[PDB]
Description:
Chain C: Belongs to the RNA polymerase beta chain family. The structure is cut from a larger assembly and holds two copies of chain A, one copy of chain C and one copy of chain D. By secondary structure, chain C is largely without helices or strands.
Amino acid sequence: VTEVEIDGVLHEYSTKEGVQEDILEILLNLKGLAVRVQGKDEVILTLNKSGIGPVTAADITHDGDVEIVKPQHVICHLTDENASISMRIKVQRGRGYVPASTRE
Amino acid sequence: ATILAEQLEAFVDPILLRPVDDLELTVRSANCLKAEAIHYIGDLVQRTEVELLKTPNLGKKSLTEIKDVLASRGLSLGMRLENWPPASIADE
Amino acid sequence: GPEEITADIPNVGEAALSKLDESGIVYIGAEVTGGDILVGKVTPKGETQLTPEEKLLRAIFGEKASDVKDSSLRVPNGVSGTVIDVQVFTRDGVEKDKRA
Amino acid sequence: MNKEILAVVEAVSNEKALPREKIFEALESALATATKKKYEQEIDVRVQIDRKSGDFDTFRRWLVVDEVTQPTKEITLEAARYEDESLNLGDYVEDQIESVTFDRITTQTAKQVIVQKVREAERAMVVDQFREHEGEIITGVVKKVNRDNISLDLGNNAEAVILREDMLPRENFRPGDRVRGVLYSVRPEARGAQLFVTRSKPEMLIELFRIEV
């Protein structure tokens, strides 16, 4: 994964109303996401979830070729009745370790 | 290198194309042209300024806004198109 | 005269204030580099006296009692970052601008 | 119609005999220059000079021609058929307007461009002043010493350049000395009229003896 855009979040050091982890911890949990793509260079996955409880990795609206390989992966925990995250995730191919400081 | 390779052979106009609402002027200047079912400024360039002045859908301030837009000479220069497309505007 | 905290300053570039808002202060969240502009600040220059060639500029531009240089705050050369929090404190009597 | 320019017109210490109205246009485009960078081209020196107004809004132009060179200033008669053939061949019929370039900011750069425009006007005035005489047997005093060139300072804030090729070989001049000769350059020079004298020509000493006897 490369880019994440949470909806009501300006910078990655903020906090969103109604999720018991910071936006930085959500970025680490999305960094550990194990995902297969089939016929594309890059792809944009969409996540929408509302209600008390975890936001697992199986709550991503899957496209016609993206396949999650471990759907029990927790991202964050929503913790109120009307408090919802809605993010866009960018997943792409690559090789090795390409950090953020080299390459918005 | 031959031994090691043999040990692996069993693996391997931009102003006219833009919308009238995209203009820097206010929404009224775009709506004056849009009242005649025009969405692109190419349709405004397809019709003459005299033909637009013969319709009361445009206003006095809309005429000044049209003059301010035509001061850049990108639109309303009295041109004639086929319908929409120039040769550079080709379908691919 | 006093200093101008507004963005309206000269000697700039699209790269001089493409991350600032309409009132000089950088956004909350704008990931900057080493040497951009965070707060745009312009100060006065020379006073001396009204010259013969600048007699028409003595009073013909509202706030023409001051000159204009450049003393904007910049990120010190070397550090990156992400602006997370901006505080603005105003001595009482001074006009609050739109971001304050 | 604030009437600030009206009284700003009649300053008029140094631009009384100089073209007042042209200096307003000058200062107005200088307020419009300074921090403009977008638009389509730049600004427009041409502007409806309305004496009454004072702050003449920079108006644009369309220049009726029969040609396709200067794209933002091009009309034809076929394009004039939409105006019912009212336009004739060659007119400078204006059909567009422009605005200003701002604030706090952009106005000491406008002060700076106002100064630039004033300087250009002063250069034109100096050219006219040097054209009034058009070369005469005037004197002067050296002030600066350049490479193969001597700078002289006359009266009424006037400076003249003495070529070393039009000077004597052994006879060397320095600052503080007073020399006299006949100039022969007041038309095309460089950003005005660089007074170029020639203290070596015959006509140079034609009235030199006349000054004595």
